[PDB]
Amino acid sequence: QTGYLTIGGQRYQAEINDLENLGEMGSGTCGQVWKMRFRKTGHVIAVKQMRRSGNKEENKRILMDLDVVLKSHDCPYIVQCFGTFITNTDVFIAMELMGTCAEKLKKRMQGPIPERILGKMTVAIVKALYYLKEKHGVIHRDVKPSNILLDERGQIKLCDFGISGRLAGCAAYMAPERIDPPDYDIRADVWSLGISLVELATGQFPYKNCKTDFEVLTKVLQEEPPLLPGHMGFSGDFQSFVKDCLTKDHRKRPKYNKLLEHSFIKRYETLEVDVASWFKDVMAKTE
């Protein structure tokens, strides 16, 4: 159904003219996203705008992302859709895109992200990927820090499913078996998460000084997997978790049900980490 806004738990009958445009948001990865204010209540939401005369290749990825979002309404680690508006020339999609991606948090910190923050981030992203495969048979195919969102209340969610498959991504985070496939990609997203954790924990992308896309894939296959350094005070569980996701042989790479039993995961499922306070202090460093 269209023409409804469900901010929180209250459903409001609304149209596009009931929202005030406050300017553009992000980089326009999937499509043009607006920061808008609902005049009836005062809430600020993110609204995608898909034009029927727009690029048909971009419009296909927008509808594919929306399809996965709509059927993932019962997973708390995936961004939610608040409503849709269908006019004769546009489609407006109200989503939970408020907050900052992990890539922009890295640029503002100008340094490593603390382990206690990456622990809660790992739990949310692994459970989101495990939900997609078990309940829908979907693989993400593009796990990277720019697709990991954090908000004011300390929530962490996956967002972009534009190229998700029902069983190509950035070359920097491509698993070895997606570069050199034998004869199988259920665990390629696990490798992408491992590279993302190394990049955020150190503030440096592991495959450095590559000037072309093909050079990155060469070093993924030719060199040993980039491991977590041992002189930054990282716990033994964190180093053990990263080493498991970064197993080059995908047959020996652990499974989601096996990863969800790791001591690193079980620790931050129960540990109380104030992600909201850490988020506000990093956001309060204007640059």
Catalytically annotated residue among 65, 142, 160, 189: 142
Return the closest-CA partner of residue 14 out of 51, 43, 35.
43
- Tokens for 275, please give them: 């992600």
Name the nearest CA neighbour of 246 among 183, 199, 167, 190: 190
Q: Let me know if 142 is a catalytic residue.
A: yes
Burial of 27-62, coded b for 16+ CB within 10 Å and e otherwise, reads eeebbbbbbbebeeeeeebbbbbbeeeeeeeebebb
Give the CA count within 13 Å in the CB-facing half-sphere of 154.
Answer: 13
The total of other beta-carbon atoms located within 10 Å of residue 115's CB is 21
Which residues fall within 8 angstroms of residue 193, CB to CB, at 6 or more apart?
122, 125, 126, 129, 143, 245
**27 Cβ contact partners less than 8 Å away, ≥ 6 residues apart:** none
Burial of 71 (0-12, 13-18, 19+ CB in 10 A): middle
User: From the annotation, which residues make up the binding site for ATP?
Assistant: 25-33, 48
Question: For residue 254, what is the DSSP state?
Answer: P
Using a CB cutoff of 8 Å and minimum separation of 24, what contacts does 75-79 make?
Answer: 75/127, 75/128, 75/131, 75/135, 76/155, 76/157, 77/124, 77/125, 77/127, 77/128, 77/131, 77/156, 77/157, 77/158, 78/128, 78/131, 78/132, 78/157, 78/158, 78/159, 79/149, 79/157, 79/158, 79/159
DSSP assignment string, 34-97? EEEEETTT--EEEEEEEETTS-HHHHHHHHHHHHHHHTTTT-TTB--EEEEEE-SSEEEEEE--
Alpha helices (H) in the chain, listed in sequence order: 56-70, 102-109, 115-135, 176-179, 188-202, 213-222, 236-245, 256-259, 263-270, 275-283
> From the annotation, which residues make up the binding site?
25-33, 48
Reduced to 3 states (helix: H, G, I; strand: E, B; else coil), residue 256 is helix
Classify 263 in phi/psi space as left (phi over 0), alpha (psi -120 to 50) or beta. Answer: alpha
Q: Could you tell me the domains of the chain?
A: 1-98 (no CATH), 99-287 (1.10.510.10)
